[PDB]
Each structure stands twice: as C-alpha cells, then as structure tokens.
Design a protein around this motif. Structure first.
Motif, short mmCIF file in Angstrom:
data_model
loop_
_atom_site.label_atom_id
_atom_site.label_comp_id
_atom_site.label_asym_id
_atom_site.label_seq_id
_atom_site.Cartn_x
_atom_site.Cartn_y
_atom_site.Cartn_z
N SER A 1 0.85 -1.18 0.00
CA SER A 1 0.00 0.00 0.00
C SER A 1 0.89 1.23 0.00
O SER A 1 2.12 1.14 0.07
CB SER A 1 -0.92 0.05 1.22
N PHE A 2 0.23 2.39 -0.05
CA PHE A 2 0.87 3.69 0.04
C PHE A 2 0.11 4.51 1.07
O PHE A 2 -1.13 4.46 1.11
CB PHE A 2 0.83 4.45 -1.29
N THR A 3 0.85 5.25 1.90
CA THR A 3 0.25 6.21 2.81
C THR A 3 0.81 7.59 2.52
O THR A 3 2.01 7.84 2.72
CB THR A 3 0.49 5.81 4.26
N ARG A 4 -0.06 8.50 2.07
CA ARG A 4 0.30 9.92 1.93
C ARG A 4 0.06 10.57 3.28
O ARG A 4 -1.06 10.97 3.61
CB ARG A 4 -0.51 10.59 0.83
N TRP B 1 7.87 10.69 -3.45
CA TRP B 1 7.26 12.01 -3.47
C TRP B 1 5.89 11.94 -4.14
O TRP B 1 5.59 11.03 -4.92
CB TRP B 1 8.16 13.01 -4.20
N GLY B 2 5.04 12.91 -3.80
CA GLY B 2 3.76 13.05 -4.46
C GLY B 2 3.47 14.51 -4.76
O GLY B 2 4.04 15.41 -4.15
N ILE C 1 1.47 11.06 -8.84
CA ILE C 1 0.42 12.07 -8.89
C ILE C 1 -0.63 11.60 -7.88
O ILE C 1 -1.39 10.68 -8.16
CB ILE C 1 -0.16 12.23 -10.30
N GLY C 2 -0.61 12.17 -6.67
CA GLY C 2 -1.36 11.56 -5.57
C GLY C 2 -2.86 11.72 -5.71
O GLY C 2 -3.63 10.92 -5.14
N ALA C 3 -3.29 12.74 -6.43
CA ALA C 3 -4.69 13.00 -6.71
C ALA C 3 -4.75 13.92 -7.92
O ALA C 3 -3.90 14.81 -8.06
CB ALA C 3 -5.39 13.67 -5.53
#
Ligand SMILES: O[C@@H]1[C@@H](O)[C@H](O[C@@H]2[C@@H](O)[C@H](O[C@@H]3CO[C@@H](O)[C@H](O)[C@H]3O)OC[C@H]2O)OC[C@H]1O
Length: 307
Positions: A121-124, A191-192, A222-224
C-alpha cells in the motif's frame, strides 16, 4: 513519445511503467472501471482517513476498506490519504497535537489496520502538507511524518510513505519553503504532487518540483488529480484543456511512476461532504463519450500498469 521511466528502486516502485490509480469512492471507482474496461483495472485504489477521528471511525474505515478490496480482484494497492485536521478545509491543523501523543490510540488503530491488510500500500502522510486549508506547521508536520515512518519500519508494515505536495493549489511555494516540511530522504519512500487546475501544467513550479524530486532520488506519484474547473462534459474542449496536457505531463517527466485520477461529480460530493468543491465541475469520464473514448485510448498505452 512516452519517455522511458527512471528507476529509483523505492519501495513498491515499478521498474519500468506507471501505476494506474483511480478513486475516490467505491461506486465511482467501479463506474470508472466499467467505462475504461475491466482489463484496465487500476493497480491503485484511493482511500482516506483522518487520524484525529475517534478510534471507532478508524476501525470502521479499516473494516470497510478490507470489504471493498476483497470484493475487487486480488493485488489492488490502497493509496491512503492520511489527514490530521480539525475541520473541513478550515486551516485547523492538528499536527502539534499528534506530535505530542494526543492521538496515539488512533495511530495504533491505524497501524493495526495496515498490519491486518497485510498487502502493499501507500500512505500519503498529511497529504497536501503545505496547503493553508490544512493548516499544518513545518516542525510538527516533520515530527509526525518521521514518527509514522519509523513505526512502519519498526512494525514491518507493508506501506510506502508518500510526501505529497499540494502543488498549484498551494501556489507552488519555493523549494526552500517546501523543504521546511521535508523530513529527509531516509523517511520518505515516494514524493507526491496533486494536480488540479489546468494552468498548473504550464507553471514553472511544476517542472521545478519534478527536477528536485529527481535529485532527491525519489519517484513521483500524482497523488490526486481531476479536471478542476474543466470537467468532462464539453467533449473535445474538455479533453484539450485538461486531459491532453495531463497525459503530456506523464509522458514528459520520467520520474512519474504512478497517477491517481478522481472520477467524481464534485458538486454532489461538495454538498454531501461539506467541502468547497461546488464549482470544480463533473469529472466522471463515463458521462462524456469523447472523453471516455480518448481516456480509454490513453489507458491502452503499454507504459500503464493495470491490475
Ligand atoms: O477529507 C478528504 C479531503 O481532504 C480530500 O481532499 C482531496 C484533496 O486532494 C484536495 O483538496 C482540495 C485541494 O484544493 C483546495 O483548494 C481545496 O480546499 C481542498 O479541499 O482536492 C479534493 C480531494 O481530492 O477529499 C476526500 C475527503 O475525504
């Protein structure tokens, strides 16, 4: 014309392609998948949790997330927007309180969910960390990020940390100001940056952001993203205003290794959730045949990693 990707060998970073991601609710994700094609199922599913909510809301968030993921094909990676705000875009940053241990019980509930999920998973952490609407402060934001990053490491949690900038929505602050929020390469897996208004694509701050991500040796997610103030309902006009530069940006910046597209009727969610997105326009690609077909065609690019 899709530049070969750079590889930084970061946690869960693909060697050669770009992860396909979408969100950011269960039914919007399924509508988007039905529009692009089941063979173009995203590798990444967007979700969100606020670590200042009650422990039970962390637990119910975790339970619903597992429910959603286990009703999707195996292998989807949740991409978690982790917030610690005390209001809905009111600048009510609670990072000092988190930094001081006042929400450790929620953090433990969060760690337990990721450990039970037991999958990449990824956590921003504190996504869009410099946006005034979140109200975070640099020194406490870093301490929170390092604490969670170290807890991931210590518990062998299967989640990559993502330091995700608000980009043009936060007026592309200079690198010195950005670095005030930077916890250091040793605590950051990716990075995002989140990309919304169409003018962002031509802003020199965006290129500068990619330039320094590359020399921090970190891949960019591109986080969103969504066609803010454009939407999809104007067909080719919508496509040329936002989607055309969007896919140009992916092609032209070799350090971008994932993207997350938000397939939302923003007016609906603004009223439902109480956030100020009323004029963001309708981003549901299935509501316009031109946009849907053009987007489906981009997803056929072999650079994109589905499934
Ligand atoms: O509570 C969360 C929201 O925080 C989340 O917000 C994301 C985020 O990526 C972003 O936030 C806006 C950025 O532009 C500013 O001008 C706005 O004030 C912000 O709200 O865009 C909207 C969302 O994608 O959405 C999900 C919620 O659960």
């Amino acid at each position: 014309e899709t530049k070969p990707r750079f590889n930084y060998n970061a946690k869960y970073e693909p060697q050669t392609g770009i992860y396909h991601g979408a969100g950011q609710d269960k039914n919007g994700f399924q509508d988007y998948v039905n529009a692009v094609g089941q063979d173009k199922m995203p590798a990444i599913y967007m979700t969100y949790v606020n670590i200042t909510a009650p422990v039970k809301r962390i637990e119910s968030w975790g339970k619903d997330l597992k429910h959603v993921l286990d009703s999707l094909p195996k292998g989807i990676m949740p991409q978690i927007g982790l917030a610690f705000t005390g209001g809905k875009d009111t600048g009510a940053g609670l990072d000092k309180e988190v930094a001081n241990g006042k929400y450790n019980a929620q953090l433990e509930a969060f760690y337990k969910v990721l450990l039970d999920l037991d999958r990449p998973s990824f956590t921003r952490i504190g996504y869009e960390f410099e946006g005034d609407w979140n109200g975070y402060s640099p020194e406490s934001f870093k301490k929170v990020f390092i604490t969670i990053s170290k807890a991931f490491e210590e518990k062998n949690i299967k989640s990559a940390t993502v330091w995700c900038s608000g980009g043009g929505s936060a007026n592309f602050i200079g690198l010195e100001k950005l670095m005030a929020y930077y916890p250091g390469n040793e605590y950051v897996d990716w990075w995002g940056i989140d990309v919304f208004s169409p003018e962002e694509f031509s802003n020199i701050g965006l290129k500068n952001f990619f330039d320094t991500a590359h020399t921090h040796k970190k891949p960019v997610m591109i986080g969103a993203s969504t066609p803010r103030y454009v939407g999809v309902l104007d067909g080719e006009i919508s496509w040329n205003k936002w989607f055309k530069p969007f896919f140009e940006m992916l092609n032209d910046n070799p350090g971008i290794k994932a993207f997350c597209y938000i397939n939302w009727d923003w007016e609906y969610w603004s009223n439902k959730n109480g956030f100020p997105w009323h004029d963001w326009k309708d981003a549901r690609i299935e509501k316009n045949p031109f946009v849907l077909e053009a987007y489906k065609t981009e997803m056929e690019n072999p650079i994109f990693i589905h499934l």
